[PDB]
């Protein structure tokens, strides 16, 4: 029809089959995740949002699933990223130098998906889901990503890397999940340094974005939590990926 309940697009078509298949698949590639029963994962997942008003979703609603998806990612090789999805993934895919959220079982199950149910019903709503901004922040998708992103920051140790999109005017954005969940949930007992990689978008190597006002902010935020801060520009990310694929491949 012409109206729709919510302002957001509705559940990714064939959601259950997709999440379940992604489960099987991930438990096939990654051997320390073969104890996982995928149908169980699915039931945890479903039970987090099915028959709940999709604006009255909590982190607790997700804890059964967070328990089934329990995973150790080497705590010193974590790559956080904000608003620069594709470089972060093309990077970790070369030789697994680092792990992003989407290299975890849970992050790989939800990545690029949308889901919600209805209060009155056990039906998945394929027609519309709440919008973070126009409707409510406590919706199935937003709440999932916040909880998993928190846990993932809290898992991290030693030198933690963040990739940031330097093409944005707010390179460090206090209102992103990085700036408002992860930055606050890095554990200062365990995290020695946050190292920012500011990924330039063009004219190759523009200004030094490590002097960006928002970057001086991130820095003082992190310094006052007693974690050291370090920043590096990445001028040509294409060249940076070719260097990672072939170190000492002429410039690298
Ligand atoms: N993998 C996704 C993803 N795929 C699609 N989407 C994802 N959101 C977050 N995640 C991950 O959580 C992190 C934090 O989410 P956020 O920066 O708020 O994405 P935003 O720039 O706020 O984009 C959020 C929206 O983009 C969709 C969701 O439908 C909805 O969460 C992201 O860095 C990313 O690792």
Swiss-Prot record:
Compartments, as annotated in UniProt: Cell surface; Membrane
GO cellular component, as recorded: basolateral plasma membrane; cell surface; extracellular exosome; membrane; nuclear membrane; plasma membrane
Glycosylation sites: 56, 120, 165, 175
Mechanisms controlling activity: ATP inhibits the cADPR hydrolyzing activity.
Gene Ontology biological-process entries: apoptotic signaling pathway; artery smooth muscle contraction; B cell proliferation; B cell receptor signaling pathway; female pregnancy; long-term synaptic depression; NAD metabolic process; negative regulation of apoptotic process
List of catalytic residues: 75, 157
pH behavior: Optimum pH for NAADP(+) production is 5.0 from either substrate, activity is much higher at pH 5.0 than 7.4.
UniProt GO molecular function: identical protein binding; NAD+ nucleosidase activity, cyclic ADP-ribose generating; phosphorus-oxygen lyase activity; transferase activity
Catalytic activity as recorded in UniProt: 2'-phospho-cyclic ADP-ribose + nicotinate = nicotinate-adenine dinucleotide phosphate; NAD(+) = cyclic ADP-beta-D-ribose + nicotinamide + H(+); NAD(+) + H2O = ADP-D-ribose + nicotinamide + H(+); cyclic ADP-beta-D-ribose + H2O = ADP-D-ribose
Keyword Protease found: no
Expressing tissues: Expressed at high levels in pancreas, liver, kidney, brain, testis, ovary, placenta, malignant lymphoma and neuroblastoma.
Keyword Oxidoreductase applies: no
Topological relation to the membrane, as annotated: Single-pass type II membrane protein
Residue spans, topological domain Extracellular: 1-252
Disulphide bond pairs: 23-38, 55-136, 116-129, 210-231, 243-252
Function as written in the Swiss-Prot or TrEMBL entry: Synthesizes cyclic ADP-ribose (cADPR), a second messenger for glucose-induced insulin secretion. Synthesizes the Ca(2+) mobilizer nicotinate-adenine dinucleotide phosphate, NAADP(+), from 2'-phospho-cADPR and nicotinic acid, as well as from NADP(+) and nicotinic acid. At both pH 5.0 and pH 7.4 preferentially transforms 2'-phospho-cADPR into NAADP(+), while preferentially cleaving NADP(+) to cADPR and ADPRP rather than into NADDP(+). Has cADPR hydrolase activity.
Comment field (misc): A cell surface antigen recognized in lymophocytes by multiple mAbs.
Summary of subunit composition and partner proteins: Homodimer.
Family label: Belongs to the ADP-ribosyl cyclase family.
Protein name: ADP-ribosyl cyclase/cyclic ADP-ribose hydrolase 1
UniProt source species: Homo sapiens
Range within the parent protein: 45 to 296 of 300
